[PDB]
């Protein structure tokens with residue numbers, strides 16, 4: 001009841017509508033992206049610096065690293081929201097890579113509506129240090145967006161883009177989109 005047609009609007013970018021949201025995938029360097037929110041896939045201590053989390057914390061800077069540890073030593077967090085530092089975003093949302101990916105993406109969507117944000121960029125959450133399988137991760141990300149549209153919750157959010165480090169993982173996401181297409 002929600003899916004549009006899969007097409008390529010720009011070289012290396014693939015998209016489809018999911019209700020009112022445009023869902024996009026591409027391979028590349030997530031630290032070069034501009035969006036209201038960029039998502040970091042990290043550990044339960046919010047201080048992983050390996051793979052995509054290394055690139056995100058290095059680019060963002062030490063004030064963001066200090067924000068993460070300051071919040072981590074205050075309460076038990078499922079995820080944390082910090083400033084963007086020297087990334088091109090308004091906030092970073094740091095999610096735990098080993099957690100249920102559908103739950104993590106649902107939380108990101110809800111927090112973006114609370115701030116009236118329109119754009120999100122995320123990596124293939126859980127496929128790095130957490131070693132979750134790429135088709136399970138693709139299925140979970142897209143299912144979270146579908147549920148969000150189905151509940152009537154999308155109002156400010158208009159664009160969700162996954163920027164994926166390994167081209168082989170992009171191929172898995174594209175196949176999942178084609179399975180769903182309207």
Ligand SMILES: CCCn1c(NC(=O)CC)nc2ccccc21
Nearest residue numbers: 051052053054055127128165166
């Ligand atoms: C040697 C390649 C390591 N690597 C990075 N590196 C970066 O993101 C740059 C520091 N991301 C990955 C994502 C998935 C799998 C391996 C990854």
Ligand SMILES: [Cl-]
Nearest residue numbers: 097126128129
């Ligand atoms: Cl991960």
Ligand SMILES: [Cl-]
Nearest residue numbers: 123124164165
């Ligand atoms: Cl990735």
